[PDB]
Short mmCIF file of C-alpha atoms in Angstrom, two decimals:
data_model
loop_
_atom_site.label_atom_id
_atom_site.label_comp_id
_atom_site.label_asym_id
_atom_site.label_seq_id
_atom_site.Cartn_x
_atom_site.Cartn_y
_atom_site.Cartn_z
CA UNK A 1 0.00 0.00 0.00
CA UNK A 2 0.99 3.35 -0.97
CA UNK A 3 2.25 6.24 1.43
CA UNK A 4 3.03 9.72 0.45
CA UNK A 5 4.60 10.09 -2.59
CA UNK A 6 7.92 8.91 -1.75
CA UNK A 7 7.02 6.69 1.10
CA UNK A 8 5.16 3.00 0.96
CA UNK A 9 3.56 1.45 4.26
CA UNK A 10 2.12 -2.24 4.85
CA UNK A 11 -1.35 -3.02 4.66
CA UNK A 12 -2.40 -5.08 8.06
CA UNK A 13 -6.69 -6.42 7.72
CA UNK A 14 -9.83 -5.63 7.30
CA UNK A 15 -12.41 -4.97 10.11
CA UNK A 16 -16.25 -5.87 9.62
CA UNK A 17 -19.04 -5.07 11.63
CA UNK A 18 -22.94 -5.73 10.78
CA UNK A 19 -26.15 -5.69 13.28
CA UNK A 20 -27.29 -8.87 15.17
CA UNK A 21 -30.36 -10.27 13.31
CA UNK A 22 -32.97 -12.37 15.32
CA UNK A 23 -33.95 -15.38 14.78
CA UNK A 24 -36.03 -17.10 18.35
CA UNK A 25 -39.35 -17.13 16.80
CA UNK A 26 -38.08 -18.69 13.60
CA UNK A 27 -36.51 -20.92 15.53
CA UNK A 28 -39.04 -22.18 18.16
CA UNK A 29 -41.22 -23.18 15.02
CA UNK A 30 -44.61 -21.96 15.82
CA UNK A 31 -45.85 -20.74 12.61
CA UNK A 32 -47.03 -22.97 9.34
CA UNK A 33 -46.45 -22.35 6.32
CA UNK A 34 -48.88 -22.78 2.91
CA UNK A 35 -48.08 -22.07 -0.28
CA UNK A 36 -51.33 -20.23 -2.04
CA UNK A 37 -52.09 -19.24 -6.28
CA UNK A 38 -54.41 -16.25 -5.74
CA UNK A 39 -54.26 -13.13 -3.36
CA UNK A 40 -57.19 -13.76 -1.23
CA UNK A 41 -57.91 -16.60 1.17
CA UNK A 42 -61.03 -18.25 2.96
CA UNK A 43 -61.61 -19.55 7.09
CA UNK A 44 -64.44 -21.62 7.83
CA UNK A 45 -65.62 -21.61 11.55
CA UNK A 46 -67.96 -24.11 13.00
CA UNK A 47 -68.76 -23.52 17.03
CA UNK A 48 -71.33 -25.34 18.48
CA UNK A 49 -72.60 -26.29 22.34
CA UNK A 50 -74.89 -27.39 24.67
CA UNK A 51 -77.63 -26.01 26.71
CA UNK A 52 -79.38 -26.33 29.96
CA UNK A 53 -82.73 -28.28 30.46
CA UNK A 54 -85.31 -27.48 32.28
CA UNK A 55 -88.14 -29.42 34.75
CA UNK A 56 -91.42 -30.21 33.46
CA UNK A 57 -94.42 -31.44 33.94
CA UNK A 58 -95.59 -35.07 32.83
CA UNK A 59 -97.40 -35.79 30.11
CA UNK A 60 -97.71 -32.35 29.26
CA UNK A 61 -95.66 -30.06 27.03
CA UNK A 62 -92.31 -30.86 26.09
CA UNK A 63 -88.73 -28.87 25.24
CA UNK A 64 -86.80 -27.71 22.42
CA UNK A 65 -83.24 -27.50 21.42
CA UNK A 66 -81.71 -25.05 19.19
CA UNK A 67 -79.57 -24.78 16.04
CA UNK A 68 -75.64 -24.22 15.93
CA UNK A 69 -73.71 -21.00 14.19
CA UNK A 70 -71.44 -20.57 10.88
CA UNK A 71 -68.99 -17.67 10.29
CA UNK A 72 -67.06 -16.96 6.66
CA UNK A 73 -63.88 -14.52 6.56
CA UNK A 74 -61.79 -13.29 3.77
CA UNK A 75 -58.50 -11.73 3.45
CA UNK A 76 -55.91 -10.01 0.89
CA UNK A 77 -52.10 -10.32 1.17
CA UNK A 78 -49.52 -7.44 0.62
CA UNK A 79 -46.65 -6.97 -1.34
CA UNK A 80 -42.62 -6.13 -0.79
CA UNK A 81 -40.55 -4.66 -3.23
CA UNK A 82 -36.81 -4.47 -3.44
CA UNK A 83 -34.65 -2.93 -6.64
CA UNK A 84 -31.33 -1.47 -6.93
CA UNK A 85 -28.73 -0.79 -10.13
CA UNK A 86 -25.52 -0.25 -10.51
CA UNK A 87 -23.31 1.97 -12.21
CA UNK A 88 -19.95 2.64 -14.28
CA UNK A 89 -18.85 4.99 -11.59
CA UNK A 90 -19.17 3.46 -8.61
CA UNK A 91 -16.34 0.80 -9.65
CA UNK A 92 -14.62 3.34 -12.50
CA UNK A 93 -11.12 4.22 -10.59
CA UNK A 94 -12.41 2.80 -6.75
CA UNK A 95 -9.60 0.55 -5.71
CA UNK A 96 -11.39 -3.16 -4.21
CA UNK A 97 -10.77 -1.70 -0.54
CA UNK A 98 -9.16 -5.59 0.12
CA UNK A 99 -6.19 -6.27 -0.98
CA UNK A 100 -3.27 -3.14 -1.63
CA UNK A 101 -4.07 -3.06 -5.26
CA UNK A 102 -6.90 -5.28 -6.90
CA UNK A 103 -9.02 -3.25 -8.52
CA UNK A 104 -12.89 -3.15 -8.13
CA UNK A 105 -15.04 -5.63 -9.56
CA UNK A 106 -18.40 -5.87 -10.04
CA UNK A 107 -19.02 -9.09 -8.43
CA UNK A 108 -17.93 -7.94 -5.22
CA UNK A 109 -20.66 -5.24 -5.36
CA UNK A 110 -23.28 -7.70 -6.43
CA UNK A 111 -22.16 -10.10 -3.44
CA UNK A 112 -22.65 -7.13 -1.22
CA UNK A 113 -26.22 -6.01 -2.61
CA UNK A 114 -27.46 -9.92 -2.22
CA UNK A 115 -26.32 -9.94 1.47
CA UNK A 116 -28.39 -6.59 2.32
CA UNK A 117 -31.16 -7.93 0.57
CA UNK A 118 -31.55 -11.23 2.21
CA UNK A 119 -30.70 -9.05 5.48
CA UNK A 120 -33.63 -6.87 4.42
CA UNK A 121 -35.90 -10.29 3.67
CA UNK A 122 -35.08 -11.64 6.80
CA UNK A 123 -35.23 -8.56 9.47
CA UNK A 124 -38.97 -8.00 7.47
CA UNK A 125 -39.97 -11.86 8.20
CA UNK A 126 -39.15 -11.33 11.89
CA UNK A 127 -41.27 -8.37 12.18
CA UNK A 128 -43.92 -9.63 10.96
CA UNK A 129 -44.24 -12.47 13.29
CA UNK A 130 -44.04 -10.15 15.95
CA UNK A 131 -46.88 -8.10 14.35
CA UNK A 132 -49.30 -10.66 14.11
CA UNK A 133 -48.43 -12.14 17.57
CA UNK A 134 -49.87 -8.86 18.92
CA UNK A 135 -53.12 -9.31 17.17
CA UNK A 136 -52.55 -7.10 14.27
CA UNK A 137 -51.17 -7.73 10.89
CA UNK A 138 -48.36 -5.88 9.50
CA UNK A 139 -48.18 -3.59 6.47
CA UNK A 140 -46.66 -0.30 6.86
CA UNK A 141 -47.90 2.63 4.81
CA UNK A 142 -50.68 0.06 3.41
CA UNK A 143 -54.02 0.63 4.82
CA UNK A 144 -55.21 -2.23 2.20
CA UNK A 145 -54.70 -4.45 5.05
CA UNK A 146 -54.63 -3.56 8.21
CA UNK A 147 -56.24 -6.59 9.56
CA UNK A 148 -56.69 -6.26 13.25
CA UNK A 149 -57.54 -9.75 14.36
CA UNK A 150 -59.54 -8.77 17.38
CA UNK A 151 -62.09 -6.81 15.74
CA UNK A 152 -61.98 -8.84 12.62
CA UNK A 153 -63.21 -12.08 14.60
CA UNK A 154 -64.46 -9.91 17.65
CA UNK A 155 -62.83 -10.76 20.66
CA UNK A 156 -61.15 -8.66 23.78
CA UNK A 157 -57.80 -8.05 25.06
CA UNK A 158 -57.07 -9.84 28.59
CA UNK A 159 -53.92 -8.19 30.46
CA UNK A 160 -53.51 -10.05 33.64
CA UNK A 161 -51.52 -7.24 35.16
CA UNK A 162 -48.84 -7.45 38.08
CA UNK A 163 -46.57 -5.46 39.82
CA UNK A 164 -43.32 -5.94 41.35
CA UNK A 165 -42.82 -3.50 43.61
CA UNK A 166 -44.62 -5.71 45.97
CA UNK A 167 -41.74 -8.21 47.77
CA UNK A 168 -44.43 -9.81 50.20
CA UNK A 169 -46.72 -11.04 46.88
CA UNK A 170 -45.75 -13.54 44.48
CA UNK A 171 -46.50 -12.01 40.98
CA UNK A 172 -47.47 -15.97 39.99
CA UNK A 173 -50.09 -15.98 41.55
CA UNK A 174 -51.39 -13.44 39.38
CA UNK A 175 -50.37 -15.22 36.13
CA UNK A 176 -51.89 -18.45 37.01
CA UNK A 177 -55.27 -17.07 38.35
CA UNK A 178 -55.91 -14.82 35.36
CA UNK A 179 -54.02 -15.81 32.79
CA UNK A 180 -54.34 -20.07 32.37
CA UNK A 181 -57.93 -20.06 33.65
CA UNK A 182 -58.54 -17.60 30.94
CA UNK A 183 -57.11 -19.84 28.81
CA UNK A 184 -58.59 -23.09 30.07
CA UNK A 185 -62.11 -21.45 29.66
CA UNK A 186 -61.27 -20.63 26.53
CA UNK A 187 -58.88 -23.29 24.48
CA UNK A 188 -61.94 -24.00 23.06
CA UNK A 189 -61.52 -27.73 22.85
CA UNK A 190 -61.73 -30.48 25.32
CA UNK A 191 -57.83 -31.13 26.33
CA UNK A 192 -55.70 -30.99 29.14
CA UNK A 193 -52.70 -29.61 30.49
CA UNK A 194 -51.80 -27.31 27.63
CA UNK A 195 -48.22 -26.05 28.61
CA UNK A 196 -47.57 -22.15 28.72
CA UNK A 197 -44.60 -20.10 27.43
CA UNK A 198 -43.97 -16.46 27.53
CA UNK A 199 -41.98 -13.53 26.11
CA UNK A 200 -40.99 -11.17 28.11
CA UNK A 201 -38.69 -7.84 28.18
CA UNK A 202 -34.85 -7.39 29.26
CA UNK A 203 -36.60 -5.56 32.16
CA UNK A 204 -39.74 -7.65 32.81
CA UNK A 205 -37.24 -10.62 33.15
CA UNK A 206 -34.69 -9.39 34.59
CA UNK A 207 -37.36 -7.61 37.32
CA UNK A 208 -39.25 -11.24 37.67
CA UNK A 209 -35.90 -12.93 38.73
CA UNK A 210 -34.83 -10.26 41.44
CA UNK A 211 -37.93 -10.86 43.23
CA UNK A 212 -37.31 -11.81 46.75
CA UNK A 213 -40.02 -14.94 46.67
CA UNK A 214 -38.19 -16.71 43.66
CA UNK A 215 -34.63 -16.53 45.28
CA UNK A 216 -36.00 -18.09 48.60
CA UNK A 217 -37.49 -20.53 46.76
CA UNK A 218 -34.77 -22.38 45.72
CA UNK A 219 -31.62 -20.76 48.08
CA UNK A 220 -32.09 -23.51 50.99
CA UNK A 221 -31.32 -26.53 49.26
CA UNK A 222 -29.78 -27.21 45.82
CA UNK A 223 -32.49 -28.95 43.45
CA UNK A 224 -31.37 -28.21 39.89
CA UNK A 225 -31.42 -25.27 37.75
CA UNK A 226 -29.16 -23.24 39.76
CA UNK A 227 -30.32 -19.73 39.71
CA UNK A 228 -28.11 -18.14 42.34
CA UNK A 229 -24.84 -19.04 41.19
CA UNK A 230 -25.22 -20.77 37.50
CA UNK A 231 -26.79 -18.59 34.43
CA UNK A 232 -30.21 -19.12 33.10
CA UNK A 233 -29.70 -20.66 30.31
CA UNK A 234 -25.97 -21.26 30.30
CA UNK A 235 -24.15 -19.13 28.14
CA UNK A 236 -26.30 -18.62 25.42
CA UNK A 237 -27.50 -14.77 24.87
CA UNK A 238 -31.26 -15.69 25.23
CA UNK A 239 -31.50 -16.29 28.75
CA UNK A 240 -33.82 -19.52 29.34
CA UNK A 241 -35.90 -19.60 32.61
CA UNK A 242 -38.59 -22.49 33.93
CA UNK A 243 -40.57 -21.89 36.93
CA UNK A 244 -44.24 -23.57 38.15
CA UNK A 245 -44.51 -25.48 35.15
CA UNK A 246 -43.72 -22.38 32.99
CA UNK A 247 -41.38 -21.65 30.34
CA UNK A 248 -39.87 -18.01 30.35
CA UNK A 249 -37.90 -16.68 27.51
CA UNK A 250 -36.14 -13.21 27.26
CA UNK A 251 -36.48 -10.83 24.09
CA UNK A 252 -32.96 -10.03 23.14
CA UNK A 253 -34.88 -8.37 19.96
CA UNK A 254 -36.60 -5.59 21.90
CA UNK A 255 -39.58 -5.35 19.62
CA UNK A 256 -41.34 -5.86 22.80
CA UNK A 257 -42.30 -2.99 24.89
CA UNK A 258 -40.38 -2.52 27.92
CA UNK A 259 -42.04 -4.03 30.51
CA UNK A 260 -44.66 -5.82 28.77
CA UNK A 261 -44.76 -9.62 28.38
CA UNK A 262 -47.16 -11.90 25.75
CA UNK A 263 -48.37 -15.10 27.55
CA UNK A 264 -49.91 -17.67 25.31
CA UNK A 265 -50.29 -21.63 24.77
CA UNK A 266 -48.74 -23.85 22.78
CA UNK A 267 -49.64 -27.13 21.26
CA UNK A 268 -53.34 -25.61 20.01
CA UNK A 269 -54.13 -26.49 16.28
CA UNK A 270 -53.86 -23.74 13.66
CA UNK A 271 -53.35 -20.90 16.00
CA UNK A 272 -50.44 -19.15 13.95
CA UNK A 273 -50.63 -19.52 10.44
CA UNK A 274 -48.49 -17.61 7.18
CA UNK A 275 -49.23 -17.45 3.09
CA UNK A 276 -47.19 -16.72 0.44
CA UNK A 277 -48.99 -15.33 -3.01
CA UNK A 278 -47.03 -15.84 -6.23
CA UNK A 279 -45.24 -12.58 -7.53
CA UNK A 280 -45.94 -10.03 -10.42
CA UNK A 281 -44.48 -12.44 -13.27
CA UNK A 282 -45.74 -14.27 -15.99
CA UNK A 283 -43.67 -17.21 -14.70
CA UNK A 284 -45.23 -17.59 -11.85
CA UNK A 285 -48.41 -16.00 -12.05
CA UNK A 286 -50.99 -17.96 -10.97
CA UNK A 287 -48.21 -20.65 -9.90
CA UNK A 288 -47.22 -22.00 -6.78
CA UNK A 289 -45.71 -19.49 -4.42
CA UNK A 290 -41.96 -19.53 -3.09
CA UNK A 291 -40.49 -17.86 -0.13
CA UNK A 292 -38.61 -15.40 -1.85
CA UNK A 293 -37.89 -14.44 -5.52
CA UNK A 294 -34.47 -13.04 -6.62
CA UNK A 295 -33.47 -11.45 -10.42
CA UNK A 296 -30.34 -10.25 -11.79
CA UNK A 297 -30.17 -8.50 -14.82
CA UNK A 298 -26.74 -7.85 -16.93
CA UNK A 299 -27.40 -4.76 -19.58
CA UNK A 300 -26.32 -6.20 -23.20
CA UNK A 301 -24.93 -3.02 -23.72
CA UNK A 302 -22.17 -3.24 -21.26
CA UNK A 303 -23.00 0.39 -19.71
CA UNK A 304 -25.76 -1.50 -16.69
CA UNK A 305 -26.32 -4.07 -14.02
CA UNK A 306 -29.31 -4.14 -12.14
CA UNK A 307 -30.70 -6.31 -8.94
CA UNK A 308 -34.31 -7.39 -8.54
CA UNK A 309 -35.92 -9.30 -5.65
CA UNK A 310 -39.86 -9.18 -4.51
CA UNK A 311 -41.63 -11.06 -1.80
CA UNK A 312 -45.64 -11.28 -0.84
CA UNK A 313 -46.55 -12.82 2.33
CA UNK A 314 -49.40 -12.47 5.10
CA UNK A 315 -49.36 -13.68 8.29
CA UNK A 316 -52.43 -14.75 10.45
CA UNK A 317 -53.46 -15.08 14.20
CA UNK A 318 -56.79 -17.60 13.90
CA UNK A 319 -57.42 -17.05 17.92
CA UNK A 320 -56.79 -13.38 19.29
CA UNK A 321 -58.34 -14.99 22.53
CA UNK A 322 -55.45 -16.64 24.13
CA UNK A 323 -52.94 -13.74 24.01
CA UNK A 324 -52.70 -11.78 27.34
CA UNK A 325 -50.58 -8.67 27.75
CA UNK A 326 -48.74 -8.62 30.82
CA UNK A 327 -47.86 -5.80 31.83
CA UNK A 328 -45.42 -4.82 35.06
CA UNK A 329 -45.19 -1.89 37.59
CA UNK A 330 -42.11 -0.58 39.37
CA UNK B 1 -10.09 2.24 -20.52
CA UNK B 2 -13.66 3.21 -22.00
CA UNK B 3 -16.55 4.15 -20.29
CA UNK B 4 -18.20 0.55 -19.78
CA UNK B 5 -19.24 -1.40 -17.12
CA UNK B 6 -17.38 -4.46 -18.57
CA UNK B 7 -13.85 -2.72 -18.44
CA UNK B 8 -14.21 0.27 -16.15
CA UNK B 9 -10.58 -0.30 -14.75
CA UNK B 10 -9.25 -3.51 -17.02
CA UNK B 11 -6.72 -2.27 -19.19
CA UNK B 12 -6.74 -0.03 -22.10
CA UNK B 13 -6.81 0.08 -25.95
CA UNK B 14 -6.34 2.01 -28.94
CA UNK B 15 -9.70 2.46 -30.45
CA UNK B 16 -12.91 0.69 -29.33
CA UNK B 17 -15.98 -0.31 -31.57
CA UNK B 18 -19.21 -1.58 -30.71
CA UNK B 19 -21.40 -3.01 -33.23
CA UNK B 20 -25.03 -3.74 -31.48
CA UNK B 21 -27.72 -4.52 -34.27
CA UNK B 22 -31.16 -4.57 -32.22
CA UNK B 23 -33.12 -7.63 -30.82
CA UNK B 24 -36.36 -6.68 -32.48
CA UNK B 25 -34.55 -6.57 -35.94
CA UNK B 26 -35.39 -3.25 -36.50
CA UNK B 27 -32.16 -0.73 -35.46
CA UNK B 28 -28.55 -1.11 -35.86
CA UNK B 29 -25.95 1.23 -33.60
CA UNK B 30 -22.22 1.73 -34.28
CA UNK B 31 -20.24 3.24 -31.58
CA UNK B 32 -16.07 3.87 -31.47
CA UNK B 33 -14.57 5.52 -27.93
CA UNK B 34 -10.85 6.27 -27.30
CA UNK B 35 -9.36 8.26 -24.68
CA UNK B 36 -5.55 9.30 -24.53
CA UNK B 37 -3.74 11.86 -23.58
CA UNK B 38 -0.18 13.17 -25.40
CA UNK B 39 2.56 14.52 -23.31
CA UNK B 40 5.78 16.37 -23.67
CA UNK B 41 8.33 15.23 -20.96
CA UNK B 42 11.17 18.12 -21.89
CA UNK B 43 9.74 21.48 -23.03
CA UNK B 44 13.07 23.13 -22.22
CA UNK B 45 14.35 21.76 -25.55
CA UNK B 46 12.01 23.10 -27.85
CA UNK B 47 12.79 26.62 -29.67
CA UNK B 48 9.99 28.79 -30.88
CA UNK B 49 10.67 31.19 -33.65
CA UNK B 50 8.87 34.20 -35.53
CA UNK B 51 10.07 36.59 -38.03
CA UNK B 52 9.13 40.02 -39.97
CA UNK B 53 7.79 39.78 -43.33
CA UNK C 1 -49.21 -1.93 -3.45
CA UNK C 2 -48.67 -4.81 -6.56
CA UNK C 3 -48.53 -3.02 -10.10
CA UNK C 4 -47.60 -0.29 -9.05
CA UNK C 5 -43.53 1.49 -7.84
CA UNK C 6 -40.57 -0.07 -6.40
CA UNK C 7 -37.84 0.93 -3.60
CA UNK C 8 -34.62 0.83 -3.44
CA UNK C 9 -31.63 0.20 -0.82
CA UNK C 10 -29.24 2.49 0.44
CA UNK C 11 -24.93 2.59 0.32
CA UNK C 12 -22.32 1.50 2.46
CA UNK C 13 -19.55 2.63 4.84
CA UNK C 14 -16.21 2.83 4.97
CA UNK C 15 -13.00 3.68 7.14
CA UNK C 16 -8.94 4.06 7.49
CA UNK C 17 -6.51 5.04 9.73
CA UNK C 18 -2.65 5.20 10.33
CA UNK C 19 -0.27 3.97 12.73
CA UNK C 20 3.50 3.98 13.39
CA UNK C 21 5.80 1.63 15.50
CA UNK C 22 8.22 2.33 18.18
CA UNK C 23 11.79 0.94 18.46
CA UNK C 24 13.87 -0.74 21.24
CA UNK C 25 17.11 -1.67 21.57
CA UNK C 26 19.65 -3.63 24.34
CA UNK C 27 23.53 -3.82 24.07
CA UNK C 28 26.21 -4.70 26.43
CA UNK C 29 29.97 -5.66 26.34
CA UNK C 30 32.52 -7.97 27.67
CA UNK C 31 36.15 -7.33 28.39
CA UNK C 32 39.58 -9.38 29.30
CA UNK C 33 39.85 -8.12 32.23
CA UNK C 34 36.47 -9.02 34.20
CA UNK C 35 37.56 -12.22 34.06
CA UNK C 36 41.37 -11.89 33.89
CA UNK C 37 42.05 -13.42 37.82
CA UNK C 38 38.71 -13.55 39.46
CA UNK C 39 37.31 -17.13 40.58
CA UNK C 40 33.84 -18.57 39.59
CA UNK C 41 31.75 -17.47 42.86
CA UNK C 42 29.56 -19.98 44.28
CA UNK C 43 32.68 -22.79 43.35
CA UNK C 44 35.59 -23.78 45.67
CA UNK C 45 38.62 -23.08 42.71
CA UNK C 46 37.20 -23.36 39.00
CA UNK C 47 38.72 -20.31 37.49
CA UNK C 48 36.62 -17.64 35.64
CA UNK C 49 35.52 -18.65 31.94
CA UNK C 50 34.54 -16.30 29.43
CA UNK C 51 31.35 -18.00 28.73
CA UNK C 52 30.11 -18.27 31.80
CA UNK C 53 29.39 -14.32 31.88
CA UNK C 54 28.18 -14.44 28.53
CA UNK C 55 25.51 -17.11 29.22
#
């Protein structure tokens, strides 16, 4: 590498640095995935019940029983764009910014656009997740949408509330009370022992752990699950927690609210689902949908390269009724 | 070099032509590009002279 | 919304700096007569030997 004019130096390394990208909810596998033609989708409900019957008299009148209930929805799905192009200049007299003396290339650049874009892909896939675990759909700027699930179906929002600040009350005893009888009322179903997880803030956690009735609880003998003087959850970065047949689960993400935690069930059928549409070519119009679609374009006249990548998904929350937002006081 | 994506900073040539004849077989484009530059290393040892007439 | 206009991404960063290095250097000598007549301490008679100085 070159110095001033008369001078020459050594070149040493290159340094990288990029944002952390989440991936918990991808991993913990909660959503399903179909693969639709059209833009628009149908849910059939079918609730029924029983009634109450009532004392008569013999041999006189008699009682009736009524009829069940039907409801139809429909949806639409929206649509992600990505372009970008590239140009003589931006690789004219730019040395590679590797090695002392290798000029640009091209490729290099097109290496670079494809990582942004599948960073782009992915960071938009985790939102959305998050979106529709709050009840709502997401689709920014696109009031085409804007499904919220708990008016769509018609349903309410149950918090189950707690606060810390007391030491002499055991916020469990909130949870449990509000939250899984409100669930067991409601999974709809006749099971049993559904098991419970929740997400919960960097503060919310790390508040829930501090409080005096958890650290008695296991200080005066060892058990397992050390709290006091292992990690929760070893050395990973998402810190892992189990207590009273819970899971807990931190939100390294921060697309929670500080302070506020989801609780919901898991193993219920068809609670989270996602759809891909096909894209706006005649390849795949009215074809099976992929994931995600990605074009590269050289110009035949040597002066252009261009990048091209679209997506269309939607996802879905079929049961706004057994989300709960917890929400802690200090 | 010439002002293409293809050889932005590759090497350079004499005289470039592109011959493109359309895909709709319809148009046919000729195009020539050359850049240089001519330079004098020792202008101390060249006289100028001018006379009456 | 589909049909309609597209987006597009954004550029990049980049960064150098400079550094310099310091020097440091360590000498010493050895003459005849440091070792001329004087006796190997720590030993009843050996004489002196030159390379047990420069060891």
């Amino acid at each position: 590498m070159q110095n001033g004019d008369f001078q020459i130096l050594d070149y040493t390394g290159l340094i990288s640095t990029m944002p952390r990208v989440d991936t918990l909810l991808q991993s913990m596998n909660l959503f399903t995935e179909h693969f639709g033609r059209t833009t628009v989708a149908r849910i059939e409900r079918l609730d029924d019940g029983a009634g109450d019957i009532k004392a008569v008299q013999r041999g006189g009148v008699r009682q009736h029983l009524a009829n069940d209930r039907k409801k139809i929805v429909n949806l639409n799905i929206p649509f992600f764009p990505l372009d970008r192009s590239i140009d003589r200049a931006d690789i004219q007299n730019f040395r590679e910014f590797g090695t002392e003396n290798a000029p640009a290339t091209v490729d290099a650049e097109v290496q670079r656009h494809m990582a942004r874009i599948r960073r782009s892909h992915a960071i938009l896939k985790s939102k959305a997740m998050y979106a529709a675990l709050k009840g709502t759909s997401w689709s920014p700027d696109d009031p085409v949408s804007d499904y919220n699930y708990y008016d769509v179906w018609g349903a309410t929002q149950t918090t189950a509330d707690v606060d810390f600040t007391k030491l002499g009350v055991d916020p469990i005893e909130v949870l449990e009370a509000e939250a899984r009888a409100h669930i067991i009322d409601w999974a709809g179903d006749n099971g049993d022992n559904y098991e419970i997880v929740v997400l919960a803030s960097r503060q919310w956690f790390s508040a829930l752990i501090a409080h005096p009735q958890v650290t008695g609880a296991y200080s005066q003998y060892p058990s397992t699950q050390e709290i006091l003087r292992r990690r929760l959850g070893g050395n990973a970065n998402n810190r892992i927690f189990e207590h009273k047949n819970i899971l807990f689960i931190e939100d390294i993400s921060g697309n929670i609210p500080a302070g506020e935690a989801y609780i919901f069930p898991r193993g219920i059928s068809r609670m989270f689902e996602i759809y891909y549409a096909p894209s706006d070519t005649l390849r795949d119009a009215n074809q099976a949908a992929q994931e995600l679609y990605v074009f590269f374009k050289e110009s035949n006249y040597l002066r252009e390269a261009k990048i091209e990548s679209e997506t269309s998904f939607l996802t879905v929350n079929n049961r706004p009724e057994l989300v709960v937002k917890s929400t802690g006081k200090f």
